Amino acid sequence: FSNVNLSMGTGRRKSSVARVYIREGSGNIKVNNRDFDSYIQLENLRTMALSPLVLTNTLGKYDLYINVYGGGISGQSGAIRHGISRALFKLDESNKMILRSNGFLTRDSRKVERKKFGQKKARKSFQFSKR
Amino acid sequence: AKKSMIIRALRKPKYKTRQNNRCKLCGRPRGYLRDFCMCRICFRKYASEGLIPGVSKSSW
Amino acid sequence: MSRKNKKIKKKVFVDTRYNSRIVAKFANRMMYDGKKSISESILYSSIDLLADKLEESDKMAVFYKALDNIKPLVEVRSRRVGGATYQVPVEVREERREALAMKWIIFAARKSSGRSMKEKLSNELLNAYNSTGAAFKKKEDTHRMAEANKAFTHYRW
Amino acid sequence: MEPKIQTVNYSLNENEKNFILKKLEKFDTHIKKHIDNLKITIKKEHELFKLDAHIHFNWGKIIHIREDGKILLNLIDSAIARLYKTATKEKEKKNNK
Amino acid sequence: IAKDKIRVRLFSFDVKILDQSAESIVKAVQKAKAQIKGPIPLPTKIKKYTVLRSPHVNKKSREQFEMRTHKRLIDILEPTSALMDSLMKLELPAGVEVDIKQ
Amino acid sequence: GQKVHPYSLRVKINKDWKSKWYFDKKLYSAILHEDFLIRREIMKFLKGIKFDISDIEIIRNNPQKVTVVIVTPRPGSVIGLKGSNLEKIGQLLTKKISKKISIKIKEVKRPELDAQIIANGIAKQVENRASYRKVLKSSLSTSMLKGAQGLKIKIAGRLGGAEIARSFEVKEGRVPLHTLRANIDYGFSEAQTTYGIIGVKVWLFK
Amino acid sequence: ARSIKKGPFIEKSLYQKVLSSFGSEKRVVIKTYSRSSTIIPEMVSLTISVYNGKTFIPIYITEDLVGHKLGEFSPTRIFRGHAK
RNA sequence: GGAACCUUACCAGGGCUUGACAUAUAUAGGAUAUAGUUAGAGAUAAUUAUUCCCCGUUUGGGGUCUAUAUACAGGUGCUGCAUGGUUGUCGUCAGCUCGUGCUGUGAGGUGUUGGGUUAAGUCCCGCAACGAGCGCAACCCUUGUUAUCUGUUACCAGCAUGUAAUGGUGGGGACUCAGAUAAGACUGCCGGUGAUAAGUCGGAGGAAGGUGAGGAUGACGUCAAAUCAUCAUGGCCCUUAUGUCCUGGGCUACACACGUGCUACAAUGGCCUGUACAAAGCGAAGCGAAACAGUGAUGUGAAGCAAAACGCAUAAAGCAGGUCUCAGUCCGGAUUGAAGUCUGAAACUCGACUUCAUGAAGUUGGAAUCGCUAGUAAUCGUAUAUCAGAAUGAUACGGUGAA
Ligand SMILES: [Zn+2]
């Protein structure tokens, strides 16, 4: 019970949940006991994920651990982004205004709809073809 | 439905492939539901009246 | 009818290679089938190929100018007054400018003859850069078709 | 396109069938080049006939006509005449310039 | 860990009487003076049925129902013969049902 | 075919099922169907004697003990002769099921604060060629004066035996069907007649 | 296309009728309903009328008929070669 | 929300006539019973084993079926224009009416005709109108934040640690999570505008702002709209028949015309190899693992499990490499031939799947026409219902994700 992780946070996305742990270090990232770069194979999604750190100019001095499950690759990237934002907030009040300016505190409550009877999908309907 | 068909469904066939489930309330041969052992129309009527415990309307 | 649509998303100014919204929008227009990663890779590779076919370091510059060489100015919108349909000219808005440009390049590149993915699209991109090809032809066609029918310009309602 | 004559609960005398055809050649001088389909449904339900004619136009207009009668010949005469007149009216709608 | 535990699962259609029976049991066992592990809520089981509305052709129009089952769990430490006997002896309002494992 | 069943709307919000028990997957269908059998047999055996019962509701605390509660406003007549009719139920029920049936009679306090009772009364009246408009007006007035905050009655069918079917409706007070927190009582009844069948529906807001 | 582990299908009544015909020198015709019975190689060279729902259609069975089913040679619906 | 038999209402055939099934009236000794025989396609009849049994200590009795004679049964036969019930539709469109009063000889009108305003007959003011009811909205259920309560079968941070693969093991309430109880969003507040209004455009706080998103909820009535074929039902109709038991055929038939979907025509792709990330569901005659055999469909086996405990089930697009070169092609996989897999008594007409070969039409499709405003179109898989077996349909779930 060292509690070396100085702060902890949670983040959510479409159907994914990630738990974030701030530790002292050179900024290394550990995700699901695997390398961050090897796990999130898309550099686009990795930049997606590390954007909160670059905005809060804190990368390279805090190490991150992530336990993430659910959702797809993009969903997990968004979830860990939200988790990083919440962890930085839990750390310092100073970053609150800039994070809220970038919208990193309000999470995408947007989720997939449900299918409806009489519809091929959430909104698509069957063909009419009146003639 | 046809009471004779209801009784024959109740009875034992020569083998199970010869027998089909029926709503034994109304004997409708089809639209059956195993969890309730009755057809869609009987299920709808009685669940709507609340005679089937645990079954309420679904908001999704 | 109930105008003043809700504020667009606009938040996707792609934070991957250039922090530029216009590249993101171009990739989105590129998309088939719901495959953002494929579109992003194709676009990145193709613009790189263009930047080394013209051998400049700054790829933003050449990409943006090849877009602006196709962004149109005045287009034709059809109205009708008194049972007479008139193809009145009207000035486009800037967003519609990028839209029409990107649509024209994409259509020409897809319908061209080529070997491969970024091959087709880089080839079309430099043709636009040099102000020649199907995309530029379509742009100038729209331009001077609108100009050939400038008499009705007083119908801008 | 050429017209589709359907029937329910009734049997087509060839007399009445070519009666229907003879009433329908009125279209193929003026209207045929403007329509997608022309369906004519006959039903015999309450010791009477119920006729439903239906036409689709190339510009998105849909014409429907429902009638009842006692004698098939008279019902067909009235219903086809009404259908032709309404079709002419729509054609003139559009061509009024 | 523990010498043995009594695993008792409470099943119901109705949350109110399910909960009522839950505190009834917890009071009944704390009367017998045994250490207790918290009433722990299991996920509710939802079975959705979609049925036609009209008794005939109309297909686009339907109606949906659920069956909802609510489940709670109680764990009893250091099983006692008298404690198990009392648990079996307890009477219970209809609509809430009990499953016991030693 | 509009107008969803109000009871179905109000179940689990402010109403409850007409059968109090719960069982797992193994026993559910069999016990459900034995409940249905209980109702149909009781109602056959009683509407042989033409009796109008508000409800038949079941309580099953035990997989082999069952409590059947008939709720009605003429409890003595329903009882019959010294509970001999009560046991006439019970013996017949055990003649087909293997459980212990205890029958109790729930007395109705306010006969016109019960939509089902109102509906049965209407149906019996129109079964004896009573004029539908007069019957509906009288029943509406009586139950509205007794203290109900809103009442609506609709009968349909061959009224007065004409060839052409018709429906007649009366109402006054508040009958807010779309309100969920409303306490709306709904009753349905049905009259067999020499000219056909006549449906009677009653909504009553409290 | 049954499994091998099941072997071919012949109805039992038809099968002992086939054995009786095999033990009889008289080559009598056998009338049958079980169209699903496989032509077992033993019952080559017989004459069987199978019911196609209307009438008993007869066949002489040769060796090469083996492996088929009896219904394969009793047409059940007739087309007059024209749709008028 | 499943036509190989049953289903099944049709057809060619064979039996039964208080009937395949009931209730009640009086006989006179078992029911059908379990397993077979005789013929049979089976239904069937003759049969063989055997009985009036149980409560009473048996006769008399209490009821029970034979097997008879009836009251009676029966019908998916006609009429939805004799009907109930249920449903579609205009239409989740915002309308539809009543009490009293006033007004017109009257049918009626006013209220509900005015100016603003809203998604709305929503709201404000004025007006011979004053009020009210069914609707709108709200109350409800999911999802979106936080607080308390509980940490197994769930969770795993800091510990040890099982070589794995598994929080797997000892451990731990921190977190997620599950589900109960509550808070929270009400134009609440601020600025401008608006008739001091109703309202309206931005701003702050905040997870959520102007109905947050979705669902449920469908007024008076219309179309003699759909259904007697789910049930109920008036009248008519058959009564060894239109009823009923079984065998087989049929609902799967074709020179044709139209509607709904799937797969494609290929390079935002096909094929080969390696690797990564889900949710919602289902399991008792049912889930069926580890492994082995097999190119494969699957086979033997049984662990575990009435299951947030185990199983279905290592999701697919994706990514990392090799190959193809615009070719009717390594595109397309229809069609047929051969050999297999599973289901059940049986799958020839008329099941699904696999292996091998066969490789057609098809070059983005005329007139015309459909769906969709954001997690939406588009595409990729998963699960369920009916079910012995058999979905491109239907219901539901998640992944990527626009213009
Ligand atoms: Zn039924």
Radius of gyration of chain C from CA coordinates: 18 Å
Q: Strand portion of chain C, in percent? A: 5-15%
Strand arrangement, major sheet of chain C: 1-2
User: Hey, which two chains have the biggest interface?
Assistant: B-F, 18 and 22 residues
Distance between the termini of chain C: 16 Å
**End-to-end C-alpha gap of chain B:** 32 Å
Order of helices and strands of chain C: HHHEEHHH
The share of residues in helices of chain C is 40-55%
Structural category of chain B: mainly alpha
Q: Tell me the helix content of chain B.
A: 25-40%
Keywords:
part of a larger assembly, 7 chains, B: 60 residues, mainly alpha, G: 84 residues, alpha+beta, three-stranded mixed β-sheet, 1 helix, 3 strands, binds zinc ion, RNA-binding, ribosome
Describe the structure.
This is part of a larger assembly, with 7 protein chains of 7 kinds. Helices cover 33% and strands 22% of the residues of chain A. In chain A, a hairpin with a 3-residue loop joins β1 and β2. The longest helix of chain A is centred in the middle third of the chain and has 19 residues. The termini of chain A are far apart. In chain A, 27% of the residues are buried. Chain B is mainly alpha-helical and 60 residues long. Chain B has 2 helices and 1 strand, in the order ααβ. With 84 residues, chain G is α+β, with helices and mostly antiparallel strands. In chain G, β2 and β3 form a beta hairpin. In chain G, 11% of the residues are buried. At the B-F interface, α2 of B face α1, β1 and α2 of F. β1 of chain B pairs antiparallel with β3 of chain E. The site of zinc ion (ZN) has 8 residues of chain B, from α2. The structure holds one RNA strand of 403 nucleotides.
How is this fold's topology laid out?
This is part of a larger assembly, with seven protein chains of seven kinds.
Chain B: H1 3-10, H2 40-49, E1 55-57
Chain C: H1 21-30, H2 36-53, H3 59-68, E1 74-81, E2 84-91, H4 94-111, H5 117-129, H6 134-148
Antiparallel strand pairs in C: 1-2
Chain E: E1 5-12, H1 15-31, E2 36-52, E3 62-77, H2 81-89, E4 96-101
Antiparallel strand pairs in E: 1-3, 1-4, 2-3
Zinc ion (ZN) binds at residues 23, 25-26, 28, 38-39, 41-42 of chain B.
Chain A binds one RNA strand of 403 nucleotides through residues 1-5, 8-10, 12, 14-19, 21, 38-39, 41-42, 65, 67-76, 100, 105-117, 120-131.
Task: Characterize this entry briefly.
The structure is cut from a larger assembly and holds seven protein chains of seven kinds. With 157 residues, chain C is mostly helical. Helices cover 54% and strands 10% of the residues of chain C.
